[PDB]
Design a protein around this ligand. Structure first.
Ligand SMILES: Nc1ncnc2c1ncn2[C@@H]1O[C@H](COP(=O)(O)OP(=O)(O)OP(=O)(O)O)[C@@H](O)[C@H]1O
Ligand SMILES: Nc1ncnc2c1ncn2[C@@H]1O[C@H](COP(=O)(O)OP(=O)(O)OP(=O)(O)O)[C@@H](O)[C@H]1O
Ligand SMILES: Nc1ncnc2c1ncn2[C@@H]1O[C@H](COP(=O)(O)OP(=O)(O)OP(=O)(O)O)[C@@H](O)[C@H]1O
Ligand SMILES: Nc1ncnc2c1ncn2[C@@H]1O[C@H](COP(=O)(O)OP(=O)(O)OP(=O)(O)O)[C@@H](O)[C@H]1O
Ligand SMILES: Nc1ncnc2c1ncn2[C@@H]1O[C@H](COP(=O)(O)OP(=O)(O)OP(=O)(O)O)[C@@H](O)[C@H]1O
Ligand SMILES: Nc1ncnc2c1ncn2[C@@H]1O[C@H](COP(=O)(O)OP(=O)(O)OP(=O)(O)O)[C@@H](O)[C@H]1O
Ligand SMILES: Nc1ncnc2c1ncn2[C@@H]1O[C@H](COP(=O)(O)OP(=O)(O)OP(=O)(O)O)[C@@H](O)[C@H]1O
Ligand SMILES: Nc1ncnc2c1ncn2[C@@H]1O[C@H](COP(=O)(O)OP(=O)(O)OP(=O)(O)O)[C@@H](O)[C@H]1O
Lengths: 217, 217, 135, 135, 135, 135, 217, 217
């Protein structure tokens, strides 16, 4: 199918490998720690003990073969950098590397990493958003002003109809989906009911959605 | 407004504090490392050097007053645990704690943490998804089967109309938004054009969207 | 007869193991320190070197079989806690744990220890009783 | 009534002092750690900050007057030994000392401790008894 | 004449600065260690305390003006790399960097160092030559 | 031909050993770090793991036989000094030692090193010469 | 002859063992460090690796047999104390122990050490004496006021006769010995010559000897 | 008077400083350990916290002024050596240094130490001598063969006269002093009595004195 190499079986890397394997892709799980290799042996096609900074070992893995190589080492800067460098000289098409700090990001950038990821930082932003605002479950920003938001229904919204909550006119926003007890209703008709604790998917302007949150729920 | 305490100014915690401060909330940034306190001094209301495991220091902070306290210590299990326990005994309403592994999650759960977060793991799942599928830019899962997906337009979609790409009947999915050169089109009419490299927002069943990705783009 | 597991062969744990062995019960003496295992080899049925916080080692001991498991680690809070949690998830009937301080007691309590003991403290109470009353 | 000196306000020593105080005996609570003195101030007749290994401080306490002196220092062997020694040379009638291990027990024995206690070991025996017999 | 910037006043860098100064070139001696700046104050045109990894400080030095910049930091790999990088993005014509090991050489190479020097290795070759031939 | 001993397989020492071996001289490569010995195994006649400060090991190497011994340890002053002293007492004809700073140079001088080298410093002089004069 | 056990082959203990062996006495050199046993193997009757704090090893040495046992462990207080204790319970006649500090001295005293020695302290006193007074080579105090002193002859005393330096009347002191180029003259007659740099042995009152040092040499 | 610097307030150095101070000399007590400085504050003219290996601190002490500087650091070879070298370059007249082993002695020698002392070794020799021979209390060697010895009187010597014990003819040795109950008799006449447990001071050849010990006492 497509070949993936996950170097460094941390929480982040390990999650990558496990999830990728669940999708049924060819995933090579590489780690210097034997116990890590033993741990993710069930969740990969091939799990190998290797020092990714050692070139001959990298050739012994046959890493040149892979379309995507992921350096999920984000604590040991030298290891990460060196590995990424090795992969670059070996003409790997896509090199995605986990970064620790802004400067590690810089060195990864300059030695030609294709994509650099900061997991804890970004998730930090997200959880912070959820922190200042206990309401929102999830969201995606379409632009600086417009956004699609996933909301947890409160005791203002139980047994209320879509026509009752006229968001399309009163607030200029549109409801896209309702999730009730795992069951899912896409682009629901105005007769449909929202029960409390259900997932509600609204779409519109940020300030408008906030308005609806305030007076509506 | 509402009072927030961020204990542990790492990447995750630090991001929390910085972002929260950008929203204009009262954020107390607490850390045992002096340099961390000095670093986030600009991005908080009050930045204090404190050992969060030391109770008298915790009273010196006056943490009982705060609605939300965040333990963003995820490397030092003992520190995190001890701190969370301290906060619980001090009757803090909402305690959100960063966890490292499944068992640290367990002990946090058992000592009554209100919300436990695994940043690297979750972000790992996400980036893994982006890894197996170079196309998807972003997404949100409405349920186990249904999802809203943001897609990067290829040359197969250039100069194509919404009515030309009949997703609502042929694939059972619905287009929600088109982002062209930063400009944004919400719930676009069938006459609208999609140019390549633009952001496309489709909504529907996972496999159906996959199907559309396959034959359409 | 009845199966007992004593994890942590200190003075306290070691005393438990030695005494129980004197009563003729099946006692598994577990310790990470090799010299401890060697020391109480005579005073147990089976004495094993194991890291009780490592799950696979805990399965290698076959601890699920035991009716009573005693965590006599009272200096290393993290070890004690982690181990107790491991035993709880492994559905051990009776988990008795040695505690150091009030908060270690709290975390043991919350992760569902069946009995928590403070040996030195209680002994303080006892010796005080003996002091007030020489009889 | 009878005068007791408790040197070292740990869990064990602290328990001794607190309990003896509940039974209404004259108990002098001595500790080098100020916060310990502050903690047991409510549970003693006189609570003093003192380095029990320093002789002049021991004379400043007026320890020669006391019938019973209890050395509840069981982590710091040197401190325990030295203190016990000071008390012995000062002709104290009854010196009861908390011991850590068999050899600290030995040195306490040889410098003439009147009663040596091993809290964790003995309590180990007890809790083991409680284990074999849930009643 | 020609402008030289020597970042890192070690033995190697310091020698560069001192000697260049003896030949009468405009040499800016930069160091984070104040005492190093004080030491080579006599042997430079301008000696400045600066963190060469901090960009705003690098602009405060006005390093863009210089034809040659020498990174004589060879113990602190991160500092060396970061500084060299800063200089590269600032379009410096000639960047000569002291390297520690083969891989630091590699990263310097990839971030586009113009000349990389290994003092101990090369000098090793030389002294070896002097050994085989005493003349 | 002529026998050379290179103690300390760094970049500098390693360079000496490698180059000398390329010239086809009998070179004994000695290092306390096993991986170093393994690294320069191809570039020497005999590569041995040895603690050069330990005299009996130095006799086990049979270092008295060698005309030239090179101490290429320039980070660990104590090791360098102690080794040089050992070699001097063992009546080695030519002892060339890598030095770190002026005082290490002084102590090497006083314990009678035959030649003291400062590689990085001198290299500083050289690169400065090359900078002033691009030709 | 007489049997000696030297436990702990340090500089002090090692010197004891070596010197004792030079006198031709039966010396058992005991140490836990193998290399120490190997080092003093030539300078003892029997050199054994043993943990002197372990009782069964002490019986394996047969230490009960020895008239004198010397604990020359002065860094490791616990080891020293414990060993001394072991020897005491085993009814060793003479136990001489090296001490580190005043309190280690105390515990050794109370567990019944027969002789306690402080080498560095005493030698410290001596070298200090030599420090304030560059003249005196050696001495022995007969009492608070009276002493026998060994002096290094200066350029005041060369080619001077004993009758010339009338110490017995002018200073009340008496010359006992003259050491010239290793050759030795005991209780010398008044005709004898003292050459410079020779050893001179005077006897008398301290202040008087000082007087002679001042005006005489 | 004369100025002394004692660097390193150990047992040896500390004893030096204390004793020197008792003699009423100007003694500068230098140590890197603050508590050591605090301890010997009473027993010196000036007690200073200083790193003796740091040159600028050594100039801050003004050590160039002192006639005698003593390096009593004998555990930390590097510190001792570096310090001694510093003092030498600073043209100090007399540098006396405590040594640990033969090679530390060698390096001190080569960097031009004026006097090198081995306290534990020498005291070891002495105590060893007292060990093989329970009789000798003290002694001084005049040469390889001749010596002055202080002896503890046994019951064989009780109530015996100097003329009764004819050492001057029978053994070729001469009695110099008798110490009875603290009272002291210098160069005693032949009528004088020696009572047991008294101090006896004999002078002569080593083996001759040994002979007298054997048959006499
Ligand atoms: N040079 C190397 N070669 C191969 N594997 C390595 C190398 N260096 C580190 N690893 C492995 O990569 C993994 C990276 O995790 P690390 O300990 O760096 O923390 P992290 O990746 O930031 O945390 P996590 O990924 O668990 O959130 C480690 O488990 C480690 O065993
Ligand atoms: N006992 C403690 N009391 C107060 N602060 C602490 C304590 N222990 C750690 N911290 C601080 O909390 C922060 C937590 O970051 P840590 O070094 O644990 O990595 P992390 O938080 O897992 O990673 P990230 O930087 O992504 O958050 C650190 O900056 C540390 O200084
Ligand atoms: N993680 C662990 N796994 C296995 N054994 C352990 C672990 N931690 C400690 N132990 C062992 O448990 C024993 C407990 O003794 P410890 O040193 O904790 O003193 P204590 O238990 O507080 O007091 P006592 O010695 O009277 O029991 C020790 O001998 C130690 O070797
Ligand atoms: N030399 C000393 N002089 C006076 N007090 C001391 C001295 N050394 C220790 N202490 C005090 O005596 C107390 C003895 O407790 P320690 O820390 O020795 O543990 P412990 O007593 O064995 O534990 P527990 O709390 O179970 O009794 C301590 O609180 C300490 O402050
Ligand atoms: N980030 C930095 N910014 C500015 N100056 C630095 C930085 N890092 C190190 N320096 C300075 O540069 C100098 C480089 O010397 P360093 O300590 O790295 O040893 P070196 O240069 O390899 O040794 P040598 O003296 O042989 O050159 C040091 O004096 C240090 O103070
Ligand atoms: N006491 C010792 N005995 C034997 N080998 C040693 C000893 N000390 C250091 N070495 C070895 O000598 C080599 C010297 O390299 P070091 O790490 O000292 O850098 P350097 O010599 O200053 O610079 P370079 O690496 O360029 O020679 C090291 O590889 C080290 O393993
Ligand atoms: N428990 C023990 N059993 C046997 N030998 C021991 C024991 N502990 C220490 N030793 C040995 O006794 C010797 C005592 O020397 P230590 O290291 O204590 O310094 P020291 O005796 O004060 O110094 P020195 O005697 O060299 O002047 C050491 O060489 C050590 O190997
Ligand atoms: N670099 C240094 N600069 C200044 N003082 C030092 C330095 N290193 C050690 N000292 C001090 O010198 C003293 C030397 O004693 P050390 O601990 O070396 O044992 P020692 O002198 O061999 O034993 P003793 O107590 O018998 O003299 C110590 O008290 C220490 O604090």
């Amino acid at each position: 199918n497509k070949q993936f190499a996950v170097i460094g079986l941390g929480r982040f890397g390990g999650s990558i490998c496990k999830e990728l394997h669940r999708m049924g892709h060819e995933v090579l799980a590489v780690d210097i720690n034997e116990e890590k290799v033993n741990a993710y042996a069930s969740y990969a096609t091939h799990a190998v003990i290797a020092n990714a900074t050692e070139e001959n070992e990298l050739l012994s893995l046959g890493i040149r073969n892979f379309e995507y190589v992921i350096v999920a080492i984000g604590a040991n800067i030298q290891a990460s950098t060196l590995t990424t460098l090795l992969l670059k000289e070996l003409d790997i098409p896509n090199i995605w590397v986990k970064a620790q700090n802004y400067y590690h990001h810089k060195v990864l950038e300059k030695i030609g990493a294709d994509r650099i990821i900061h997991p804890q930082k970004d998730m930090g932003v997200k959880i912070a958003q959820s922190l200042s605002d206990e309401n929102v479950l999830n969201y995606i920003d379409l632009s600086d002003e417009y956004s699609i938001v996933e909301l947890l229904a409160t005791r203002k919204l139980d047994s209320k109809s879509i026509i009752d909550l006229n968001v399309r006119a009163k607030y200029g926003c549109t409801i896209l989906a309702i999730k009730h007890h795992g069951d899912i209703c896409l682009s629901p008709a105005p007769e449909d009911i929202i029960r409390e604790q259900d997932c509600l998917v609204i779409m519109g302007h940020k300030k408008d959605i906030k308005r609806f949150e305030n007076e509506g729920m």
